[PDB]
Structure formats: structure tokens, C-alpha cells
Amino acid sequence: TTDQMEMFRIPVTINAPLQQQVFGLRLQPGLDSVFKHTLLGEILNYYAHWSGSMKLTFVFCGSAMATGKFLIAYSPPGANPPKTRKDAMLGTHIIWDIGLQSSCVLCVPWISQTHYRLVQQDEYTSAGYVTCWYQTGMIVPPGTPNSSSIMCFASACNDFSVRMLRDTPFISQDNKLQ
Amino acid sequence: SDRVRSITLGNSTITTQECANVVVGYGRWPTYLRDDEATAEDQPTQPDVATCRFYTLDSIKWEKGSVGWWWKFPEALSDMGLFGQNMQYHYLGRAGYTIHVQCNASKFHQGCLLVVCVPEAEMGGAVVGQAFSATAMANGDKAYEFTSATQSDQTKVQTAIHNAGMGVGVGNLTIYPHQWINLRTNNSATIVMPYINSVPMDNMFRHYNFTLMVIPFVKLDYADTASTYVPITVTVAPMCAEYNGLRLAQA
Amino acid sequence: SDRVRSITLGNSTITTQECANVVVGYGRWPTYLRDDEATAEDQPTQPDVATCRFYTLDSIKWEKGSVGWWWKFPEALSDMGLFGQNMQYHYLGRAGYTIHVQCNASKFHQGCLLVVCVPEAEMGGAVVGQAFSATAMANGDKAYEFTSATQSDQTKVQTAIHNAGMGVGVGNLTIYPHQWINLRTNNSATIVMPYINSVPMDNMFRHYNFTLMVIPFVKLDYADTASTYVPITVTVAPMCAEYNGLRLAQA
Amino acid sequence: GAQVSTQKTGAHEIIHYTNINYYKDAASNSANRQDFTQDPSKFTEPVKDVMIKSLPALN
Amino acid sequence: GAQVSTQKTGAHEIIHYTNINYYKDAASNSANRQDFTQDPSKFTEPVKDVMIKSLPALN
Amino acid sequence: GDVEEAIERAVVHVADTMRSGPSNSASVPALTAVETGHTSQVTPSDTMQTRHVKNYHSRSESTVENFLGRSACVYMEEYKTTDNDVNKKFVAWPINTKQMVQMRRKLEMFTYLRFDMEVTFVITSRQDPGTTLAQDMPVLTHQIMYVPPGGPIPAKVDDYAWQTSTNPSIFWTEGNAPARMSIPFISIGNAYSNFYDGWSNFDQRGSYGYNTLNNLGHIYVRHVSGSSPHPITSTIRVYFKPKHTRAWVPRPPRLCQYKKAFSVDFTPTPITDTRKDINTVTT
Amino acid sequence: GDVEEAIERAVVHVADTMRSGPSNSASVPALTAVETGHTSQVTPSDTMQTRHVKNYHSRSESTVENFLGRSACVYMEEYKTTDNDVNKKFVAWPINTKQMVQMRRKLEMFTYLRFDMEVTFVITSRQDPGTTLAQDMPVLTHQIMYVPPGGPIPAKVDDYAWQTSTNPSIFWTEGNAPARMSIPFISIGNAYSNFYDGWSNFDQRGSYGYNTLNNLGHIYVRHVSGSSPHPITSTIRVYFKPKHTRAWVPRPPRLCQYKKAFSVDFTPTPITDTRKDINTVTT
Ligand SMILES: COc1ccc(CNc2ccc(CN3CCN(C)CC3)cc2)cc1
Ligand SMILES: COc1ccc(CNc2ccc(CN3CCN(C)CC3)cc2)cc1
Ligand SMILES: CCCCCCCCCCCCCC(=O)O
Ligand SMILES: CCCCCCCCCCCCCC(=O)O
């Protein structure tokens, strides 16, 4: 990415194979580079334990005449992340229909063996994966751009909580400021 | 607004923002088998959320020259999640279904699809007499295509579209539970099918309960656009499923 | 008479005509997880009779020179009926067990076996340090044999019988839930194990809940008979099993 | 806010002591080393059917 | 002049502690780290017209 | 009561999870519109079947009182008992909270703060190396002086200003517990301001930024009368601990490293770290 | 009450002995069957004539609370005030209870434990030998820092990480009473696990054993600013003391000697010592 602002937008195209992946990411809110510096990751990085559910909100920023459907799925921890949509659809998922309402919410449930998870997540406290796939494909009429973008928003639910204050590793100094 | 619908089965959800009403079988909602109608004596197993959930049945392309497709159930789900495992391990089964068909296009496209569930859709062979194996009409979740011209290969079914492969007028399929996808108005279709059979339970591998058909009555058309085809996707969710007669697997 | 027992789980039954009492874990009977102790939010699945049934775990020979065997659970049932399928398809699991060990011999034989269930039976390697793969102590339902002499191969566990592979006196295993099979008196042993762990649920592939051990304290002996060995069989039935976190299979 | 409770016997036998908590966390309290309840049945009598000592065991 | 209030739970669960102030300035008191009220509506729902979650947002 | 008054607080606990079954209706909780500036309030119960769960988790440790209620170092400096340079035998620090990075970032998550303060001083001494170190010296004593703005300032270790008649001071002897005190809310305004987007002069000229509102005074330290035959160096550390805290107008945490003690100046930094491609999920 | 509430506990006392006379009946208390897994509950009153005895013995000292309620050393290490090697001037210990044999064996008699903790630190210093020892040095000061998992770690004695704004710390001066504190139950699970028969990865690979569940953090120690002309060595000892203890699933005490700090590995050992023959009873 030669332009930093390009990081926030997820590309989408009119013609794509029938099943194709839009994006994939690990659900490590305090450790993954995707969530590391968000407004939620920054708060988490001051603590050692966390628990509760999360909200991922997706907004379509294409033309008003564009249309499509997307499948967004959450796969709990396992030995292998999903490779195809057939695999992804076996886990928690929602079918998103783009229309007058521009946004849809994937609520990631709290499925864990322990009451709490480490912020510095290790293999013992894995949390799973999130992936998005084409459900029907994006269709456009004549006289519209051939590409569109999506954005993602992350936040915590009302059952979220943290524990065990600690110092954040993101900020450091080598000499006294003057 | 009544053009928005949301369906939640198990750990999966379906949302549609431009849709018609919901069609419920013959006015009957799926339900469990009663004590005064059962015949098998041993306790049934009811996996509930493990099996009653939406499964996405692969996808197909709608071209200007498409003629139609069909799927046979429950064979189409024979290898899908724990539903397939319960089918393999049990002698008897019973379940209703929710069928959702997605197809979206811009305001400048035109076309119309008929979505219909045909119970006991017995089909005839391409050559009168003879016989065909159980691969000419069901091989998993893959879709089978109708043909505009009369079929000639003796190893497959008579795929002439205007007869629907059953020797009946294609225009009269409106008698079965059905819905239309007209691109001007809606982009989805939803049908709830109760369990229909002459016996309380039946083996899910030997018998095809019903057949899903999608037929373009008004062929797709468009002009001056970069979108060359309109994908069609099918999603199905068993409802109130229960099984009986555990044995070695395979079937 | 109190020497007869009958156990019915699912579609399977066990009958013993010469047996001792039944041992129930730590005085606790298996039960489902309560609402005020759960942590996972989504609905569990409870297959009931489909999974809670007796499975026969292959068989072994008791010779005059046998030293002992062990099985690790729930790995031993990892590929057994629908229990294995539910293990594969779910992230979390929870279940109690009923263990029945059969061993019968005439009135002219002699010998004694200790049957004990060891929770968290962590074992040490043959060579201090080093490491071993998850095949030296669990490869399905196959039984692993203890050794009279000290183990030397670095690729497997320290099988010295008198230490039980845990660095403790073999004679003190009486502290765990246990029972004896003394050929003079009984021919079976029955133990009911509740779910014991430090968390409400756990992944059934990553973690071994408990280990079953069968150890001949008094070696088998006989004279002038055509029976050269005494088979031993193990049967296990999960109880109150429930699962959570559906995902792609494998684990 | 002051608890008064008996203290363990000793030689020559006001056998009362006073305690007050100063900190806001229950983890700061002193050890509760005066509970003496116990029940060995969980390990000594784990059988299902009750066994009478005077009666014969097996039948 | 002595306040008595409950102390936070801990393992194994007189859960009471006593406090007295010795200085004449309120700034000398100890931290009041036992208030747990909170209300996120100021930042999560700053809109004028109330929005019903089950209803559609825009119209 | 009179002798014993009973207070009563309460545990709060996070929201429980309610049992949810299959649904088929026109309501669409999942669909919303972020354009309104409204954060969706959906819960897992609204998009999937859930069991009843009773949570006992509490958000006790996330309160601002507990978040900011930890002692953090704000300044350290060294001064010698005897030396040729007069300025090197005592310290003089203009009070501010921007010197140390960690507590600075903790504070700058809010725009306005109002709290009492608890100040603790840690002092340690060591003998300087040299060719001859054999000496006998009694225990040292130190003085900490606080001079509100506008007061006289000492110019040398034995100045007259050290005879405080109104400036508060502390005399501390080595080997004892660290010194400590409490300070009330001493701002002229209704709250402390971490940020100030404005100028000092009315015609938009002069100093710019929070440097304009820092008028908290100075702190001075010296050895009372210790003057050893051989040099001895002492170091003082100052720790601040907010009490009875209140905060307003949260703002995003800083991303770029700090570079000046009295300015927001920075160097542009990437938003975050990179990965192979948008589908990479492996380690 | 309000001022004084009265608690009420109770002595328990072991069972008394009842008078027993001659008997001749069909009941056979002495005969039983161990095959049932049942431990016989016979008493001397059931097999011989006995007098009435009133016991006043109590099992107060055998409770788990008292058994585990003793401070035991868990770690010691040395660090020098001045040296050429940077890594040798401070300590960094990953917290665990498997380092010292005695307390390890005491703990491993149970499978799961849940308790609060009381930690005490004992620090002593001594001058290193050398050709010239004449120096004068004031009293030293030490810092103990606790870093929960994932936090920044200091790389040298004068690193920035030592300015804890959120990590708890203690500053202690030599000559006073040892430092002490209390710690609550800080496990993510519902109880500590001494043993873990499982793997880290879902496909049964990676780390094995209790090493997988040890994520308690680190402890760091340094001299605050002491740097003597001649080296001085300090040693720290850490003592743990469980409080409010609960235990589950007892297991037999270990027989073989320990050989690794993070493994159960062992060498086979004889069951017990031998004697001349099965009838030998003399010394
Ligand atoms: C005399 O004993 C003292 C004296 C001063 C202090 C420091 N008191 C103090 C320091 C900082 C802030 C926060 N303000 C934020 C806006 N910035 C412009 C100025 C600092 C408030 C009070 C402690 C003990
Ligand atoms: C910061 O002040 C502290 C920090 C940590 C401790 C040690 N706390 C501690 C140590 C050990 C166990 C027992 N666990 C058994 C299972 N094993 C895998 C991990 C250790 C519990 C708590 C003390 C003071
Ligand atoms: C932080 C609490 C300090 C308590 C000091 C000792 C007690 C002084 C008051 C006398 C006892 C009465 C206590 C009470 O009223 O409950
Ligand atoms: C400067 C005040 C010193 C108080 C000393 C501790 C309290 C002694 C009196 C016992 C508690 C009763 C207090 C009260 O009557 O309110």
C-alpha cells in the first residue's frame, strides 16, 4: 500500500468466479495487526484478560444502482481455517443483502472453554477466524463504475469486560523528553 | 415495511431487503411426529440446532440461453454437515425444509424465474423402455440442466423443458407450492415445505421426497453493461428433523 | 440377590450375573451443565440416545506374563459411531462415562486385576528431557502395554509398571475411583465417572480427560486345561453428552 | 464492625479474641484456619447401593 | 464516626471493613474506588430521535 | 449509630444472555445504517439461537478511578553534595506531566481532568568513584521545597530562600520510608486541560498550545547541610497518583511517538503493520 | 451489635469408643469384600471387648488450610550493583511453582487448587571480595516489578520500562522489615491445575503437559540507583503462602526424585527398602 488511506477499503469487482473470498482475518483483537490499533485494541492493550462478544459492522459504499449478496461467517477455533465457502458456511454466519439499508452487523458470539482469554493470545486461547465470500455476485447497470469498496467497524457488546491492568507496549522512549 | 424479511435457524441467519411474502407449503407448518401416528418403537434422536440450519447449495450461472435446472432432495444434502452423517447412520428420517433462492440484478435487467417444489417428481427415460442409473438425475448438490431440444442419449432422462420431464404441461406447475422471481420486483423466493409422504417415516437415501425446479419463463436480457451473467444461489435448512434406527453407517 | 446387575443406555443393554457393587465416581452422578455455570452463549446440541450408548472397545489377551495396559479417553472413542462425528464437528464437548470391564474364568483359575480411572494422568518420557509425539500413548482404541523392565527407547513413554508411568507408587492408585476383579468372586467391574475438569467444557481432541488402567497384581495361573488365555474386554458408554461450537470437521 | 470469636484451647484449661478488617479487598484478610468440617464418604464409600457393616457384603 | 461497608468478593465465596478519617481536609481521604455506575448512551446513542433496534433505521 | 454508620454499595454485573429460539418475521435487527452516527445495539440473542447464561463478570477494574489510580514516575534528576559548579548541587523542576511518556499517554486519553493528587518521593544516594574513597559520613538529610508561581527562587545551595516561612517543605532522613503528601485541586479553571488549541496574546500571537496554561510552580531539592570530603550523588524520583478522578470528552490514544515535552510535534507513522495479502490468516 | 458481632465456631473431636461385651451371633462385621471398592468401616468395638473412652483429640492441624498455610521458598537469584555484563545486573523470573522440590511436592498432592496468595520478599547484600574494599556507601534501595503477560520487558538496568505507570511495584530500603503483599485468584480457569494431560495445538502437537497453562507473568528486580565503586552482590528470596485454600481430586504423593522444572520425567525407583526375609522383625 503506497497510500495509507487505501488500507481502510476492501476492493470488490463486478465479474468474479462464482465462489470467491473477499477477505479473511484472525480474531485476535489485542494482538492482530488488523485490530491492534483500533479504538478497541488500544483499550485492550492496557489489560491482560478480556471476555465477551464483539460486533463487526460492514457498510457498502458503492453506487445506489449496484446490488449483491455476501456471506460473512465466523469459524470457532480449529486445526484448519476454512478454504472454501462450503467450509465457511458450516460455522456461524449471516447472509447480507445490499439494499436501502447500507449496513449489516455480524455479532461474534462468546464461545470459549475459559471465562477469560489472554490479550497476548497464544495457541491455548485461540479465538477463531472471520471470512467473507461472494454469495451471488455484484451486478451493475450501464454507466456505473466497475469497482466498489466496503468498510468494517469493530466494537464491543454490552457483556464485554477486561481485567488485570498492565502497561501498553506501543509507546516507548530512549531519553528524557525536553 | 413488509418487503424486509429475516429468518433465523440454528447458528445461521438469512436477511433479504427486497422480497415477496413467504409461502408455507399447503398451509401446514413443519412439526414433530405425534405419539398416535408413530409406528417405530425405539426412542428417536432429535439433534435440533446441529442439523436444523441453513446450508448453501453451490451456485450456477444464468445466461441468456439458459433453459432451467433441478435438484432432488434430500439427496442434495446427502454429504452436508451433520445432516449427512445422521442420514448415513440411521435407517429412517423425517424433516421439513425451508428453501431460499437468491438472484439479484440491476434495475436495467429483465427476466422471470419460476421456483416450485414438486413432491414425487417421477421422471421418464430418454428412450421409451430401457433404464437409467441413479446418476442421470441425482449426483449430490450438483444441478442438472433441462434441454430445449428432445433428449436422445439413452443413458439420461428426457430433459425436454416444455414437458418438465414428467409428461405434463410446463405451464401447469403452478398447482404445486411455488413462487416467482421477477427482476423488476423481487430478488428472492422463500418456500416452507412440510413433510409429505404416505408413511410416517422413510429412508432418506432410497426415496426422493421432492424436487426443486428453477425455470426461466422470460429469458434474461440486458444491453451495454459489463455484467455478463447473473448468478443464482440456493439455500436450504431442514426443520424439525428426527431420525430412527441406528446401524452401521453407509446407506 | 444383589450379585445381578443390568444397565440400559440407549439401544444397548449390559447384563452381569456375578458381579460386585457399582462405584459412582466421587459420589456424584453425571448431569447436564447448569445455566449459572455455563460460559458459552450459543445453544448446545444434545444428541441423547444417538451418542449415549455402550461401545465395545476391542479385546486383548491375558497371559501368564502380562504386566498391564492403559487406554486414554475420550481419544479411545474418537472414531466410534456418532460420538466420533460429534467430536470432529464441534469445538467443545462435555460428558460423563460408564466403564464396564468383562473378564470371566473357571473356578480353577486364579488372579486379580485392578481397574482404576486416573484423571489427568500426565506421563513422562523414557529419556529425561527429549519429547515424544502423540502416538506413544494414544492411537485410537488400541491398548498400550506396560513393561516390567525400564523403558529405553526415547520415542515412547516410560512404561515401568511399578511406577505407573507417573513417578508414583503403583500401590497407591487406590485413591482414585477403582474396583478389583478377583476371579474367585467376580467377573466384572463397573465405574461411573462424572465430568471432572477445571473448566466447564473443553476440546475433546486436545485434552485427555482421564486414563483407564488395568493391572494384574496377582498374575494369572492355572494347570491342566485347554484354555491358554483369558480374554479381557472393555465397554464404555458416554452419559449426558453435549457439544458446542459447530465448525468445519476434523480436529 | 468488630468480630468476636473463641480462640483455641491451651494449657490451663478469656478465650476470646477481636478482629477488624482494614482493607477493601477480601483477599487481604487473614487465613480462615478455624474450619474443621470433614466428610470422608466421598473416598471411603463411593458405592451406589448402601452397604451395612454388620451384614455380609456380597449377598 | 466509623464507616462500615462491604469489601470485594474473593476466593472462597466477614466481608466487612471499617474506615475512619483522621485529617481535616477531604483531599487526605483514600481513593473511592468502589463506584461502578456507567452509562454509554452519551457516546453510543447521541441521536435526537429514538431508534428502535427491531425497526428499520432509515424509514 | 453515631459510632458506626453503615454504607451500602452494590455489585453491578454485566448483562445476562436470554434464551432465543427460531424466528421468521419482518423485523430485521441485524440491518442498520451507520450514517446516523449510531452504534448498533444488537446482541447475539438477536441473530442466532442462544442459551440462558447468568454472567457474574463486573467492570470494576475499568473505571477511570482505578485506571488512573496508579503511581507513575514523572521526573528524576541528580544532585551532588559537593562540587565546583553551584548549579549542579540542587534541582529546580517546573512542574508538568509531559516529561514521561507512559503517564503522559494515559492522561491524554481525556481532554479535561479534575482530581486530587498524592505525591511520593524516592531518594537514593551513591558515592562517586575516585582514587580515594575511605571516609566516614553520618546519615544524610534532604529538603524538598515547593514554590508557588511568583515566589522567590534560590540561586545556590545555601541561599536565604531555603528558610521557608510560608512555602511548604519536607525534611527527610535516609533509611526511613519515602516521603508522601496530598494535594488538592489547585487549578484556576474548573478542570485541568491536557490540550489547549489557542494562543496567549489576544491577536493570535505568542506561545501556542498547552504550554500557555502550565503555571503550577516549581520544586527544589538539596542536601540540608551534608558536605562530604568526597563527592556523593543523590537521585530523586517523583511519583504522582490521582485521587477522586473525573474525566470528560475522551479522545483517541496517540499513535506517533513523542518528540517534545511541550509540543504535539510528531513524525508521520503508518496506520498499522502489513501482511502478505488480504486473505493471509496463517502465522 | 453494630459494634460487636459474635461469631460461633465449634470443636469437633474424633469419635468416642463405646463399651462392648461378649457376642455370639450371625453378624460378621469383620468379613467384607474389597472387590467393591469399599473401605471397611469396622472399629475395634466390633471385634473385641472395649471400655468406654471419651476422646478429646481433634483433627484441627490436618486441614488443607493449615497444611498448605506455611510460607515456602520458591525462587532465589543473585544480581550485582555494578558489572560489565548488562544481563547480570538484574533478575527476570517467569513465575511458576515447580522450581523448589518441597513446596512442589506439597502442592502436587492435589489436582486442582484455588486460593489467594501472600508473597514475601527477603533481600540481603554482601560485598564481593577483592584487593581493595575500603569504601563508604549509603543504604541501598531495591525495586520489585511485576509484569503481567504481554507487557513490555526491561532489557537493561536503566531502561524506560522501569517507570511503571500501571505495573505494580515495590520500593524497599535495606534494614527494614521484609516486603509483603496479597494477591487474589488470578487464573483464567475456575481453578489452578497442577497437571494437564493434553497438548497445545488442536491436532495433538506442540508443547505437552503443564507447561501449556503457565502464563502468570514475570518478576523483575534491580538496585534503584546504587552503583558502588566496588561490586556488591544482592540475593532475593521469594516466599509463597496460600490463603483461603480449596482442593479437589487428591492423588498419591510422588515417589521418584524430580529432574526437570517443566516436565514429569523421572527415573524408575524401587517401591521401598528391603529386609532379610519376610519374618525378620528385629532391628
Ligand atoms: C507542591 O506539591 C505538588 C505541587 C504540584 C504538583 C503537580 N500538580 C499537578 C500537575 C499536573 C496537573 C495536570 N495539569 C494538566 C494541564 N497542564 C497544563 C498542567 C498540568 C495537575 C496538577 C504535585 C504536588
Ligand atoms: C505479582 O505478584 C505475584 C505474581 C504472581 C504470583 C504467583 N501466583 C501463582 C503461582 C502459582 C500458581 C499455581 N499455578 C498452578 C498451575 N501452574 C500451571 C501455574 C501455577 C498460582 C498463582 C505471586 C505474586
Ligand atoms: C481503616 C480503619 C481503621 C480502624 C482503626 C481501629 C478501630 C478504631 C475504632 C474502634 C473500633 C470500632 C470499629 C467499629 O465501629 O466497627
Ligand atoms: C485523630 C483521631 C484519632 C482516632 C484514633 C482511633 C479511634 C479511637 C476511638 C475508637 C473509635 C471510635 C471513633 C468514634 O467514636 O467515632
From Swiss-Prot, chains F, G:
Subcellular location: Virion; Host cytoplasm
Chain spans, region Amphipathic alpha-helix: 1-14
Domain of life of the source: Viruses
Cystine pairings recorded for this chain: none
Membrane spanning residue stretches: none
Assembly and interaction partners: Interacts with capsid protein VP0, and capsid protein VP3 to form heterotrimeric protomers. Five protomers subsequently associate to form pentamers which serve as building blocks for the capsid. Interacts with capsid protein VP2, capsid protein VP3 and capsid protein VP4 following cleavage of capsid protein VP0. Interacts with host integrin heterodimer ITGAV/ITGB6.
Role of this protein: Forms an icosahedral capsid of pseudo T=3 symmetry with capsid proteins VP2 and VP3. The capsid is 300 Angstroms in diameter, composed of 60 copies of each capsid protein and enclosing the viral positive strand RNA genome. Capsid protein VP1 mainly forms the vertices of the capsid. Capsid protein VP1 interacts with host integrin ITGAV/ITGB6 to provide virion attachment to target host cells. This attachment induces virion internalization. Tyrosine kinases are probably involved in the entry process. After binding to its receptor, the capsid undergoes conformational changes.
Protein name, per record: Capsid protein VP1
Species of origin: Coxsackievirus A9 (strain Griggs)
Whole-protein residues included: 569 to 851 of 2201
